[PDB]
């Protein structure tokens, strides 16, 4: 009798949610942006190519100075590059070569990485000794670590394959907050620009908006039919975009609690590995499995699709804070800066 | 360039030569995925080949597209003990029908040969798998299990499934992996020559 009542209550809660969704939508974004100037063509060019290796390049990250770049590769290397002069500032060997993510601290003193070892490793860049030393090894996740993002030089937020996100203090070494509610493996995070909220995407074809200082799931977004691989905030912090294995990007709003845009195409069925916005929106840059990056108009249909130079699939892509450059890392062991 | 800029370029070149030295050292190594917290890495060496076995046990399979080979281990005696053979063949279908794993060889170890020989004299296969339609002898049932595993491969023209039987008082169980890795290296060399 308890299971039937629970199923009835869940069904009526979902039906009330859907009824709230239906009255919330009256006009789509395509009906509003049908009378604005379309962005014609973006002709990006590879300005710099950061090379020298053979192992495939997993996730990268930018600096807040828009100058230094960090990249993690399958050869157990974390390389910190100077993008203006192509010089490698730092080379950091990793204990585990199966790294899936990397982050660069907003202050610039720390880098982080993690992967199949279930540890978030924090490395100090500014030491009197002269070399990069491991500050901390955050342990506690029971699955592979898929994304990590710094809030400051004290706290970090991580997502893992145990359907769980975590907020850690990087001096004590303990999980300050544990975010639960996903049923599949969460593999993407995006921190808000004010660092009060974050959003995550899991194997359950769902995205969740979490409150950092309150420790609870504010919103749940049910869009895609497949695994959500990438997620990214809009610059204003009121919307986000998701890329999935169904060859479809989707733009959701936090306040409207609904999906607005569906960026789809009828030429490839390749999944999305990475998404990022530009400084003002208007350019959703999505990397695919077809060795290419497509540039979508965030308020319309496809615009450029021009980032064509990559021998293998674009595993990662990022946009600088000043918006000058877009760096893409692919599995051909090559980082390319595009402008 | 300024003075500090040239010194920074010199530092970058030193990092370049260190990275190249590490790459030349790691070019010998062979990565194998063992199927059958975190990873369990076991490193050994055979005939100037450094083998790294990563004991790990559809979402973590996207981090292993560059492995040399997959060592799939099956204990036969689980036919006599939810059937484990059905889960094994479902896993083998999952590891063979992947779109990104269409050219990765599999070394199929079939252990518990003596236990299966002892259990096949008293317990026939008709209590578990009565559709095989064959004898109850050791060799015929072993060949039936091997061909039942091998028939699950679809489009056997790019990769090859290597079936070996476990042995104790010898070192041929490493020599089989050495031969399979040598064939994989030969195919990769023809790929690098632009001739295959």
């Amino acid at each position: 009798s308890e299971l039937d009542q629970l199923r009835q209550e869940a069904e009526q809660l979902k039906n009330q949610i859907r009824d709230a969704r239906k009255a919330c939508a009256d006009a789509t974004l395509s009906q509003i942006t049908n009378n604005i100037d379309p962005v014609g063509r973006i002709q990006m060019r590879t300005r710099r190519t950061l090379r020298g290796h053979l192992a495939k390049i997993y996730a990268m990250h930018w600096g807040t100075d828009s100058r230094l770049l960090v990249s993690a590769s399958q050869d157990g290397k974390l390389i910190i590059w100077d993008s203006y002069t192509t010089n490698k500032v730092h080379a950091i060997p990793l204990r585990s070569s199966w790294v899936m993510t990397c982050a660069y601290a907003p202050s610039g003193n720390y880098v982080a990485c993690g992967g199949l070892d279930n540890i978030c490793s924090i490395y100090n860049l500014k030491t009197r000794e002269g070399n990069v030393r491991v500050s901390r090894e955050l342990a506690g996740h029971t699955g592979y670590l898929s994304c990590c993002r710094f809030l400051d030089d004290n706290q970090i937020v991580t997502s893992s394959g145990d359907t769980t996100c975590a907020l850690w203090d990087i001096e004590t070494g303990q999980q300050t907050t544990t975010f639960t509610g996903h049923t599949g493996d969460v593999m993407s995070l995006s921190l808000a620009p004010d660092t009060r909220l974050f959003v995550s995407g899991a194997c359950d074809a769902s995205a969740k908006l979490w409150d950092v200082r309150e420790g609870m799931c504010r919103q749940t977004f049910t869009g895609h039919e497949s695994d959500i691989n990438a997620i990214c905030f809009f610059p204003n912090g009121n919307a986000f975009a998701t890329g999935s294995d169904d060859a479809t990007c989707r733009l959701f709003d936090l306040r409207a609690d609904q999906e607005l845009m569906t960026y789809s195409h009828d030429n490839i069925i390749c999944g999305i590995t990475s998404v990022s916005f530009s400084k003002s929106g208007r350019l959703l840059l999505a990397g695919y499995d077809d060795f290419n990056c497509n540039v979508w108009d965030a308020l319309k249909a496809d615009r450029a699709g021009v980032l064509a130079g990559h021998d293998n699939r674009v595993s990662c892509l990022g946009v600088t804070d000043d918006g000058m450059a877009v760096a893409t890392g692919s599995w051909d062991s090559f980082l390319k800066i595009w402008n | 360039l300024s003075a500090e800029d040239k010194a920074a370029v010199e530092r970058s070149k030193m990092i370049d030569r260190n990275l190249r030295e590490d790459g030349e050292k790691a070019a010998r190594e062979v990565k194998l995925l063992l199927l059958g917290t975190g990873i369990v890495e076991t490193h050994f060496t055979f005939k100037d080949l450094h083998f790294k076995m990563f004991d790990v046990g559809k979402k973590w399979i996207h981090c292993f597209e560059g492995v040399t080979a997959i060592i799939f281990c099956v204990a036969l005696s689980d036919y006599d003990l939810m059937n484990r053979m059905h889960a094994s063949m479902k896993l083998f279908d999952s590891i063979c029908n992947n779109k990104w794993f269409t050219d990765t060889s599999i070394i199929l170890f079939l252990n518990k040969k003596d236990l299966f020989e002892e259990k096949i004299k008293k317990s026939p296969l008709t209590i578990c798998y009565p559709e095989y339609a064959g004898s109850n002898t050791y060799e015929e049932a072993a060949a039936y299990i091997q061909c039942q595993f091998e028939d699950l491969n679809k489009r056997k023209d790019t990769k090859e499934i290597y079936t070996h039987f476990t042995c104790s008082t010898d070192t041929k169980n490493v020599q089989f992996v050495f031969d399979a890795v040598t064939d994989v290296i030969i195919k990769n060399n023809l790929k690098d020559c632009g001739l295959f």
Partner: single-chain antibody, 232 residues
Framework: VQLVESGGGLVQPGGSRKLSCSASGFAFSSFGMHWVRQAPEKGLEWVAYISSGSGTIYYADTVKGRFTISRDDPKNTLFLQMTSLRSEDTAMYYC??????????????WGQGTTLTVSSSDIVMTQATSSVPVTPGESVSISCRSSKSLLHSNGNTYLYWFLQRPGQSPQLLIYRMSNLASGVPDRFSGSGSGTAFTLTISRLEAEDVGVYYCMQHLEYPLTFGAGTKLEL
């Protein structure tokens, strides 16, 4: 975190000696290293530089052809072999570590110094002020001038502010202007452009007395100025 000098002593003119410096507490092989003199009553002058990995070795024109700077990385040692010594070479020698990448802090640590006595183009860095009397609690400005502009096309202005307390090694305060070195209190500030350069101290304390030096790093014969003395 330690550079201990050795050698020194009294040497006859026309002789040779072998200054050594032992480095500890830091990754020695990643650092370029410098030898800098100080005359018994005068300012600092650069002598020699060896790069990390010994790729680049640069000398001063005074000591060129007579001095040889080398390093033994696995035993963490710097060497200066001085042949054909002169009465101008009576001085106290300092060994300085120097790191070079984007955002680095070169000339950050200085050794104690070793003294030897020998018995009986370039950018000119000018400090027109010296022997400035001062009381604690007052803002102090120290000026420095350069013969040519120290602003590169990179947007970097390579001028360095060091302080030498009485009976102490020079300590790096400013490496590029408005980049305060590690461990330095936030009352020292650096400003200027091109030729003109200024170091200001807001709330002066009693530990800030001593001689202040400005050095350029734009060109390889690194040049100092006759420093400004701040006394109570």
């Amino acid at each position: 975190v330690q550079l201990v000098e050795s050698g020194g002593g009294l040497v006859q003119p026309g002789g040779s000696r072998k200054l050594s410096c032992s480095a500890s507490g830091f990754a020695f092989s990643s650092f370029g290293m410098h030898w800098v003199r100080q005359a018994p009553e005068k300012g600092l002058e650069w002598v020699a530089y060896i790069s990390s990995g010994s790729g680049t070795i640069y000398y001063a024109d005074t000591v060129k052809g007579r001095f040889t700077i080398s390093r033994d990385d696995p035993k963490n040692t710097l060497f200066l072999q001085m042949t054909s010594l002169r009465s101008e070479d009576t001085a106290m020698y300092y060994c300085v570590r120097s790191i070079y990448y984007y955002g680095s802090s070169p000339f950050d640590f200085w050794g104690q110094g070793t003294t030897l006595t020998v018995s009986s183009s370039d950018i000119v860095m000018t400090q027109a002020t010296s022997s400035v009397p001062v009381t604690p609690g007052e803002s102090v400005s120290i000026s420095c001038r350069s013969s040519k502009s120290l602003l590169h096309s990179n947007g970097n202005t390579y001028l360095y502010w060091f302080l030498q307390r009485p009976g102490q090694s020079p300590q790096l305060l400013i490496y590029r202007m408005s980049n305060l070195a590690s461990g330095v209190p936030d009352r020292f500030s650096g400003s200027g452009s091109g030729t003109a350069f200024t170091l200001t101290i807001s709330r002066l304390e009693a530990e800030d007395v001593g001689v202040y030096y400005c050095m350029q790093h734009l060109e390889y014969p690194l040049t100092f100025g006759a420093g400004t003395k701040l006394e109570l």
